[PDB]
RNA sequence: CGGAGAGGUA
DNA sequence: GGGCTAATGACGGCGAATACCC
DNA sequence: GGGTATTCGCCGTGTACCTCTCCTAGCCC
């Protein structure tokens, strides 16, 4: 990307094993500076977000073993388009069923 | 206005709650320490456990007063090394990264007294600490009452905290060097010295390779 | 060529001839301060401009006016060095001639009296060392040049005023060089508002009302009149083809009697052309279009004058009838509708509630100054103050020039104040931008930001001081005596002195010299801070201004900036960049005639670069400067392109002209990641001088330029032959052709030796030259810190092997050989200052004495009789350095204190101990003792001794000069006395000085002998008076605060060795700490059995992209291989021809490389010394983007007889089996960063205790605990960790009684704590209870 | 030493 | 002396306070 | 009608440290 965050017409056609032309390194510097500023800002904002989330969630402690609540959530493998993004196998692990599952047949 | 300042009740959050019985130092790698161990400089230990050392010294009768204990420790005599080994036999310590962004950011370890001036952190734990070895400084604290020590041992130590508390799954995964060693050693070739024979268990595999 | 060059030629691999050498790298500071302090025959920057602007000073009445004549800089009381050693500023007094003239009261002016105060002293201003540095309190301080937006017009896009809406607005801000800002902004409704500074907006035309303008005048200024004719039904229009494209078809445009363009469409260019070729000028238009028009001027009745139509209101059929009956044929309306200055001003006037000057002035006065019942006189005064004051509202020449260019004026300059024409022009251009055909000024374009260096800021502070003094003198002249009085009776040095001193002492741009590295200095003085008084804010996102604009190419370094919260705000000047006269930056560029790139250079400005097209610095040129490429890479606006070789305008002068001096030194910069090379450049600066300076075998060639240009290098001012070399002084017998009239004799260079830099890093100079060595102007006489043979030597060259040796290199951690500790390389000296000041107290003035109560003989045994420790004593933390005692005039104390001092056996006296002991944690050897004693205080033995040493130094210098002078005099008197008969025989037996008593024939020869006798006497007298003046300089009282009696500064020298934890980092962005000091024989070793100094994790290379360090390793391996071969031949004592041919081969290696070879050097001795300096490798110069190819490196490997892959098989000295594959081994230049492990350890269990918040804080004898921040509490919280939170908050943090009892319990041998009643809880409980609120302790 | 302002590092 | 003594070259939110089309 | 859509003042500030400065002020005896 270039300043304004758009891709340059001519790529950085040089490797690091081979040399970099002055203009190529100049262009590459934009991305590095952008990334470093992004890093600092994201560190600060992540600290703030951790703070707000901790403040909202801190007064929450597991205190009972079973409340008998047969209520629960439908819990499905997330699929977008043709591709299954995540497996229900991953999700189901570590949960407790709200009903007694049956066979698909 | 004295009810509330920043960031709130002064003595329970910022600012600024600096606490004693703690230290801070740059970190080095020790690839000989076991997973429940951290390499801690001898001077750092000597100045982190001065009260415990004084108690032991007056317990053995080696000192008759606090002044004698002070002289005894400052003279750096060989006797205090046994005293410090005793008070550090299994007394764990708590290492916390300067930013703690997840639960593992602070973990307990068993300290091994080492020469040098840096904290020898377990290589396999630094990935969990989300730290590196670039001059960044780790911080040690000593849970110094019995019950805090046991809270450290049962919960704080890296042995009992190996899975990420974010998604489960081990957080103590080999990261960059040991994984390279294993990937090299377990690779195969199509022809090399020692090809094709049969060996009595990995006994003879070790014997023949070495 | 150079004598220092011929001592050690660093081989270069550059392939493009370097047109234009590197300029003096401190040119910015020298240019700024010379512009500031020189004399000016006109009005130009500096004290001259400030005086001409402020002066003359006129009384309110009495014709008592003070006239400026001239200013001269007082000769400084001290030179730079003794300013350093005395803790005072390097200051030159300012003396100005002022004539107070009083005329007749009252008549046509003719002076009744004139009183001329010559050279009035209004303050002593700091002077610059010529190294771009200001000594302020005896310390090197640098005025960090600022980058700030230039005064003038500022066309920007308003994107935050939208308030959740589209159509980003426009704004035009007039920024004066000083005065009040002006703002013309739009709204989401296309209404133009004016904000004078930030105060709430008003409609723009209100100012026009205050500027004496009527609605008709305003409409005439902006809108073009539209003529409507009273003829036939529906009236006719004088058709204009230039108004059909700025409006839509909302009426019937007819041609030849038929409507060609119907109402409703959009008029096209084809329609306009067809109407023009139809030649129709009067068109029948509907009356509804006439009504929709808005009239441009008032129309009244022709007989009674009653108003029927007024400007800027729409037309109607009733108004049409009124104008027809009152008599009208022509109606002048506004040219409205979007495009071509749409009715934005009409909308503003509709919003504007004023139509006359007085009401507008009232409103503006009330809104500038809230409340304050308005007065039209006061409003006029305030408006004149805000936009027509010649003394506090300035645009300056730069502001006027940028202003005219922003308005694209044919003018080049003009008034420094604002005018009505200026405001109308800026409104016109803002309206043009609103129309979508103007330009928006780039906020970060370097053609819109300018460099304010030290000179401009200093003269601005002097102008403020002149303002205060001007107010004072204006008051005094009117109030003061009408008769003779002295012009210094109303001139006070306090205002100007305070302003200038505050500027140079505590301004946010007067930074301490970042002084631990000649690179650190030379880049700190070139720093360009967007911050400052008038710049950005430390918190600024700012994401566009943090990020690099494509106009920074060759002006500031894109890749060098601190990684903290101010990346991008703090740039560093490029190598070749410099400031124009206005303040904008320029880059040199070779002019390309038509196809020939001339060596002629033009310093293209930031905006000048925009118009032109510039070829890349990597173009290949043959013949006389023709491109070998018909198609060449170029850059026109910041983006790359491929352009015809005959279409380029300019060429980059150098391949390295786009980096800072910090980044330019990194070798193989074209192989690192930009981010990683940025860390590399930032770690360049943080290197600390090692025990010896070691050249980098792989370099860039700017090391010599940086070493020479920075002042750490004693450069030979005048050429000659070195008459004397010593560890402290260099004495040059100057060449006679460079000798001055009379006898300037020798040149003495006193060398700084072990003086604390601002970073506590030792700086000293090693004399690199020897006796009788010829030197010419501009060469090195002595290497400074981190410098070898005039080459910048940041770190040292280590043997390196890249392989993850037994896991001791995990992330970037570096394993070092014990050999490194053996060689005492990477060993650093550090210098502390422990300033012990004697104070004058109300119980008795503190005294520095050797007798201290309640101390043993051991502490006193390191002290002299004066209470100051011996110079050179080995001390540790706790030992007494300065015997400070405070007279305890208060003998009354509490009974507890007396009982305690009686029982404990402590001494009881009427003086209390105040000695400055060595802080716990530092140690070393005392190397300097400085005593500052202002007049009125006795000079103790140590002060007398340091005075005697300084007198000895001055006397030795003056005595050597006397030696050369009297040698010449006695030689010529011997020549005279020998002539005129046989007299040489007794002359030989008579002493040289005893030739003044020998007789001579009474002739002109005797007269000459007598004349030279008086010459000898006069030179003697000059000697004693110079010695006396130096004694006065070294003996006079220090500039010390009155409450302070004496200052005793002791310097502590520690020689820190590298050890585990030291962040010893590479040059290319490599990082890492010392993992472990594994022994020499455990290091990997080649077939030769040679161990390896450094083992680096090979994991850091393929992830962090800095494979440049690998190329450095291979090239250093080749270089040290050449060094090994040459060293072997030296031990073999090969023929000088063999060394000559081998070295010629080594330097001849590479194609198109220009470095030139012997034999042009001396046949044997120079070749021998060159080889002797080359036996530790070939220093290789690699231009950053024009450097060595891999094939050339491999060629050097062949010449070194070492493997072509740079890989040789090691054996693990641990086991002793060759590794399964060969590994990479070479030589790498490694830098020991200032982050030393000793500086990073601190740990405690007890110690310092603070108040209010009980927690360990402050001090360095035992530093406080660790900030157990809320993040750590949260991490404990996420775990079931509960108790450890309780101890880290309650019992070992705050509660003093709990901490004491719990420490007692631990000392008792049991780890004990009981919760009980939390003390903080009880405190907060009582605190709430005092509020009349009861807290119940009900349990669940 | 209680809290704000500034440079540097991570 | 001193002892009393009652803003524009940051950035974003946010309630109060207005601004405006149908 | 009424919800945007502006204007009108206050205020908060990742992590840790290294250095520096700067801290209720008015005032009648």
Swiss-Prot record, chain B:
Effect of residue 176 to P: Resistant to antibiotics salinamide A and B
Highest taxon above the source species: Bacteria
Post-translational changes noted in the entry: Acetylated on several lysine residues in the presence of glucose.
Industrial and biotechnological uses noted in the record: Co-administration of salinamide and rifampicin or salinamide and myxopyronin suppresses the emergence of resistance to both antibiotics.
Residues engaged in binding Mg(2+): 132, 134, 136
Function: DNA-dependent RNA polymerase (RNAP) catalyzes the transcription of DNA into RNA using the four ribonucleoside triphosphates as substrates.
Subunit structure: The RNAP catalytic core consists of 2 alpha, 1 beta, 1 beta' and 1 omega subunit. When a sigma factor is associated with the core the holoenzyme is formed, which can initiate transcription. The rRNA transcription and antitermination complex (rrnTAC) consists of RNAP, NusA, NusB, NusE (rpsJ), NusG, SubB, ribosomal protein S4, DNA and precursor rRNA; S4 is more flexible than other subunits.
Similarity remark: Belongs to the RNA polymerase beta' chain family.
Official protein name in the record: DNA-directed RNA polymerase subunit beta'
Full-length numbering of the shown residues: 329 to 538 of 1407
From Swiss-Prot, chain C:
GO cellular component, one term: cytosolic DNA-directed RNA polymerase complex
Keyword Kinase: no
InterPro entries: DNA-dir_RNA_pol_bsu_ext_1_sf, DNA-dir_RNA_pol_bsu_external_1, DNA-dir_RNA_pol_su2, DNA-dir_RNAP_su2_dom, DNA-dir_RNAP_su2_hyb_sf, RNA_pol_bsu_bac, RNA_pol_bsu_CS, RNA_pol_bsu_protrusion
Record's protein name: DNA-directed RNA polymerase subunit beta
Outcome recorded upon mutating residue 673 to A/G: Resistant to antibiotics salinamide A and B
Family to which the UniProt record says this protein belongs: Belongs to the RNA polymerase beta chain family.
One function term, GO molecular function aspect: DNA-directed RNA polymerase activity
Assembly with partners or alone: The RNAP catalytic core consists of 2 alpha, 1 beta, 1 beta' and 1 omega subunit. When a sigma factor is associated with the core the holoenzyme is formed, which can initiate transcription. The rRNA transcription and antitermination complex (rrnTAC) consists of RNAP, NusA, NusB, NusE (rpsJ), NusG, SubB, ribosomal protein S4, DNA and precursor rRNA; S4 is more flexible than other subunits. In pull-down experiments interacts with CedA. (Microbial infection) Interacts (via flap domain) with Escherichia phage lambda antitermination protein Q; this interaction renders bacterial RNAP resistant to transcription pausing and allows it to read through termination signals.
CDD domains recorded: RNA_pol_B_RPB2
Reported function: DNA-dependent RNA polymerase (RNAP) catalyzes the transcription of DNA into RNA using the four ribonucleoside triphosphates as substrates. Resistance to the antibiotics salinamide A, salinamide B, rifampicin, streptolydigin, CBR703, myxopyronin, and lipiarmycin can result from mutations in this protein.
GO biological process, one term: submerged biofilm formation
Biotechnology: Co-administration of salinamide and rifampicin or salinamide and myxopyronin suppresses the emergence of resistance to both antibiotics.
Keyword Transport listed: no
PTM field: Acetylated on several lysine residues in the presence of glucose.
Keywords attached to this entry: Acetylation, Antibiotic resistance, DNA-directed RNA polymerase, Nucleotidyltransferase, Transcription, Transferase
PROSITE patterns: RNA_POL_BETA
List of residues that carry N6-acetyllysine: 1020, 1198
Pfam families, sorted: RNA_pol_Rpb2_1 (PF04563), RNA_pol_Rpb2_2 (PF04561), RNA_pol_Rpb2_3 (PF04565), RNA_pol_Rpb2_45 (PF10385), RNA_pol_Rpb2_6 (PF00562), RNA_pol_Rpb2_7 (PF04560)
Enzyme Commission (EC) number: 2.7.7.6
Catalytic activity: RNA(n) + a ribonucleoside 5'-triphosphate = RNA(n+1) + diphosphate
């Amino acid at each position: 990307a270039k300043p304004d965050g758009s891709i340059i017409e001519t790529p950085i056609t040089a490797n690091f094993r081979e040399g970099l032309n002055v203009l190529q390194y100049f262009i590459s510097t934009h991305g590095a500076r952008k990334g470093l500023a992004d890093t600092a800002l994201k560190t600060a904002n992540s600290g703030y977000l951790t703070r707000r989330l901790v403040d909202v969630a801190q007064d929450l402690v597991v205190t009972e073993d079973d409340c008998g609540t047969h209520e629960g959530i439908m819990m499905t493998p997330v699929i977008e388009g043709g591709d299954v993004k995540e497996p229900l196998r991953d999700r189901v692990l570590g949960r407790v069923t709200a009903e007694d599952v049956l066979k698909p047949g | 206005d004295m009810i509330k300042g920043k960031q709130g009740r002064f003595r329970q959050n910022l600012l600024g709650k600096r606490v004693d019985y703690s230290g801070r130092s740059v970190i080095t790698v020790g690839p000989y320490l076991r997973l429940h161990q951290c390499g801690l400089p001898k001077k750092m230990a000597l100045e982190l456990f001065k009260p415990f050392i004084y108690g032991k010294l007056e317990l053995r009768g080696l000192a008759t007063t606090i002044k004698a204990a002070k002289k005894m420790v400052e003279r750096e005599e060989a006797v205090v090394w046994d005293i410090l080994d005793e008070v550090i036999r299994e007394h764990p310590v708590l290492l916390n990264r300067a930013p703690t962004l997840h639960r593992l950011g602070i973990q307990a370890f068993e300290p091994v007294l080492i020469e040098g001036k840096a904290i020898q952190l377990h290589p396999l734990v630094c990935a969990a600490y989300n730290a590196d070895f670039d001059g960044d400084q780790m911080a040690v604290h000593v849970p110094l009452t019995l019950e805090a020590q046991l809270e450290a041992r049962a919960l704080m130590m890296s042995t009992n905290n190996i899975l990420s508390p974010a998604n489960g799954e081990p957080i103590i995964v080999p990261s960059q060097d040991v994984v390279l060693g294993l990937y090299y050693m377990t690779r195969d070739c199509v022809n090399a010295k020692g090809e094709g024979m049969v060996l009595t268990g990995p006994k003879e595999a070790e014997r023949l390779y070495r | 060529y150079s004598y220092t060059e011929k001592k050690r030629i660093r081989k270069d691999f550059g392939k493009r001839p370097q047109v234009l050498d590197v300029p003096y790298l401190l040119s910015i500071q020298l240019d700024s301060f010379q512009k500031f302090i020189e004399q000016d025959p006109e009005g130009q920057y500096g004290l001259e401009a400030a005086f001409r602007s402020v002066f003359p000073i006129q009384s309110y009445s009495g014709n008592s006016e003070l006239q400026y004549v001239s200013y001269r800089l007082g000769e400084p009381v001290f030179d730079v060095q003794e300013c350093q050693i005395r803790g005072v500023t390097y200051s030159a007094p300012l003396r100005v001639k002022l004539r107070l003239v009083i005329y007749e009261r009252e008549a046509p002016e003719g002076t009744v009296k004139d009183i001329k105060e010559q050279e009035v002293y209004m303050g002593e201003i700091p002077l610059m060392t010529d190294n771009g540095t200001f000594v302020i309190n005896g310390t090197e301080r640098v005025i960090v040049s600022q980058l700030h937006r230039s005064p003038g017009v500022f066309f920007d896009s308003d994107k935050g005023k939208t308030h959740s809406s589209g159509k980003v607005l426009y704004n035009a801000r007039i920024i004066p060089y000083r005065g009040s800002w002006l703002d013309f902004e739009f709204d989401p409704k296309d209404n133009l508002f004016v904000r004078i500074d930030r105060r709430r907006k008003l409609p723009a035309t209100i100012i026009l009302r205050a500027l004496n303008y009527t609605t008709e005048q305003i409409l005439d200024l902006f809108f073009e009149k539209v003529i409507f004719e009273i003829r036939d039904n529906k009236l006719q229009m004088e058709l204009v083809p230039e108004r059909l494209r700025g409006e839509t078809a909302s009426f019937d445009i007819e041609a030849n009697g038929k409507v060609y363009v119907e109402k409703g469409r959009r008029i096209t260019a084809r329609h306009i052309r067809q109407l023009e070729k139809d030649d129709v000028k009067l068109i029948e238009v509907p009356v509804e279009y006439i009504a929709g028009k808005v009239v441009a001027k008032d129309y009244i009745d022709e007989s009674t004058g009653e108003l029927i139509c007024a400007a800027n209101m729409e037309l109607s059929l009733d108004l049409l009838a009124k104008l027809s009956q009152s008599g009208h044929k022509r109606i002048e309306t506004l040219f409205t509708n979007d495009l071509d200055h749409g009715p934005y001003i009409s909308e503003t006037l509709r919003v504007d509630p004023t139509n006359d000057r007085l009401s507008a002035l009232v409103e503006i006065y009330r809104m500038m100054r809230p409340g304050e019942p308005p007065t039209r006189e006061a409003a006029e005064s305030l408006f004149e103050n805000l936009f027509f004051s010649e003394d506090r509202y300035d645009l300056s020449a730069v502001g006027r020039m940028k202003f005219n260019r922003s308005l694209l004026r044919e003018e080049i300059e003009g008034s420094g104040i604002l005018s009505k024409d200026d405001i109308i022009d800026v409104m016109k251009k803002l309206i043009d931008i609103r129309n979508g055909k103007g330009e928006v000024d780039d906020i970060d374009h370097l053609g819109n930001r300018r460099i304010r260096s030290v000179g401009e800021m200093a003269e601005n502070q002097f102008r403020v001081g002149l303002v205060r003094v001007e107010r004072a003198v204006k008051e005094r002249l009117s109030l003061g005596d009408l008769d003779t009085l002295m012009p210094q009776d109303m001139i006070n040095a306090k205002p100007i002195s305070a302003a200038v001193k505050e500027f140079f002492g505590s301004s946010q741009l007067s930074q301490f010299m970042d002084q631990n590295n000649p690179l650190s200095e030379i880049t700190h003085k070139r720093r360009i801070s967007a911050l400052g008084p008038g710049g950005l804010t430390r918190e600024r996102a700012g994401f566009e201004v943090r990020d690099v604009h494509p106009t920074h190419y060759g002006r500031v370094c894109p890749i060098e900036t601190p990684e903290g919260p101010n990346i991008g705000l703090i740039n560093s000047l490029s190598v070749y960049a410099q400031t124009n006269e206005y303040g904008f930056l320029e880059t040199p560029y070779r002019k390309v005639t038509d196809g020939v790139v001339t060596d002629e250079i033009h310093y293209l400005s930031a905006i000048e670069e925009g118009n032109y097209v510039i070829a890349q610095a990597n173009s290949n040129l043959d013949e006389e400067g023709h491109f070998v490429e018909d198609l060449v890479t170029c850059r026109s606006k910041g983006e790359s392109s491929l352009f015809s070789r005959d279409q380029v305008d300019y060429m980059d002068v150098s391949t390295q002209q786009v980096v800072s001096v910090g980044a330019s030194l990194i070798p193989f910069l074209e192989h690192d990641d930009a981010n990683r090379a940025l860390m590399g450049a930032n770690m360049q600066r943080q290197a600390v001088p090692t025990l010896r300076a070691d050249k980098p075998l792989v370099g860039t060639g700017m090391e010599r330029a940086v070493a020479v240009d920075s002042g750490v290098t004693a450069v030979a001012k005048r050429g000659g032959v070195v008459q004397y070399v010593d560890a402290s002084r260099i004495v040059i017998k100057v060449n006679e052709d460079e000798m001055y009239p009379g006898e300037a004799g020798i040149d003495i260079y006193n060398l700084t030796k072990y003086t604390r830099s601002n970073q506590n890093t030792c700086i000293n100079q090693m004399p690199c030259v020897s006796l009788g060595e010829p030197v010419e102007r501009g060469d090195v006489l002595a290497d400074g810190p981190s410098t070898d043979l005039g080459e910048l030597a940041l770190g040292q060259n280590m043997r390196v092997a890249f392989m993850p040796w037994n896991g001791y290199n995990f992330e970037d951690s570096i394993l070092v050989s014990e050999r490194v500790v053996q060689e005492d390389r990477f060993t650093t000296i550090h210098i502390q200052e422990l300033a012990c000041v004697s104070r004058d107290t109300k119980l008795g003035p503190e005294e520095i004495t050797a007798d201290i109560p309640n101390v043993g003989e051991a502490a006193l045994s390191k002290l002299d009789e004066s209470g100051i420790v011996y110079i050179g004593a080995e001390v540790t933390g706790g030992d007494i350095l300065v015997g400070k005692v405070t007279p305890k005039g208060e003998t009354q104390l509490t009974p507890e204190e007396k009982l305690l001092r009686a029982i404990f056996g402590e001494k009881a006296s009427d003086v209390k101990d105040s000695s400055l002991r060595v802080p716990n944690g530092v140690s070393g050897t005392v190397i300097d003792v400085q005593v500052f004693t202002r007049d009125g205080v006795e000079k103790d033995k140590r002060a007398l001794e340091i005075e005697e040493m300084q007198l000895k130094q001055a006397k030795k210098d003056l005595s050597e000069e006397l030696q050369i002078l009297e040698a010449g005099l006695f030689s010529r008197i011997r020549a005279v006395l020998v002539a005129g008969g046989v007299e040489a025989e007794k002359l030989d037996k008579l002493p040289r000085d005893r030739w003044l008593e020998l007789g001579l024939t009474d002739e002109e020869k005797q007269n000459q002998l007598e004349q030279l006798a008086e010459q000898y006497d006069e030179l003697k007298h000059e000697f004693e008076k110079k010695l006396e003046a130096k004694r006065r300089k070294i003996t006079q009282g220090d500039d010390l605060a009155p409450g302070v009696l004496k200052i005793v500064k002791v310097y502590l020298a520690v020689k820190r060795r590298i050890q585990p934890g030291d962040k010893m980092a590479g040059r290319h962005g490599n990082k890492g700490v010392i993992s472990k000091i594994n022994p020499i024989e455990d290091m990997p070793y080649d077939e030769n059995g040679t161990p390896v100094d450094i083992v680096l994790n090979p994991l850091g290379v393929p992830s962090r992209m800095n494979i440049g360090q690998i190329l450095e390793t291979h090239l250093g391996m080749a270089a040290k291989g050449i060094g090994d071969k040459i060293n072997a031949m030296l031990k073999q004592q090969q023929e000088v021809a063999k060394l000559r041919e081998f070295i010629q081969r080594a330097y001849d290696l590479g194609a198109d490389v220009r470095q030139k070879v012997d034999l042009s050097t001396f046949s044997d001795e120079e070749v021998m010394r060159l080889a002797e300096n080359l036996r530790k490798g070939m220093p290789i110069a690699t231009p950053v983007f024009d450097g060595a190819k891999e094939a050339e490196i491999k060629e050097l490997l062949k010449l070194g007889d070492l493997p072509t892959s740079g890989q040789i098989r090691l054996y693990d000295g641990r086991t002793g089996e060759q590794f399964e594959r060969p590994v990479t081994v070479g030589y790498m230049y490694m830098l020991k960063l200032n982050h030393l492990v000793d500086d990073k350890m601190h740990a405690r269990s007890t110690g310092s205790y603070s108040l209010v918040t009980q927690q360990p804080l402050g001090g360095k004898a035992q530093f406080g605990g660790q900030r157990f921040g809320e993040m750590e509490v949260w991490a404990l919280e996420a775990y079931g960790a509960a108790y450890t939170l309780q101890e880290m908050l309650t019992v070992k943090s705050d509660d003093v009684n709990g901490r004491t009892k719990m420490y007692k319990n631990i000392v008792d041998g049991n780890h004990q704590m009981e919760p009980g009643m939390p003390e903080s809880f009880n405190v907060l409980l009582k605190e709430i209870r005092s509020l009349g609120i009861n807290i119940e302790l009900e349990d669940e």
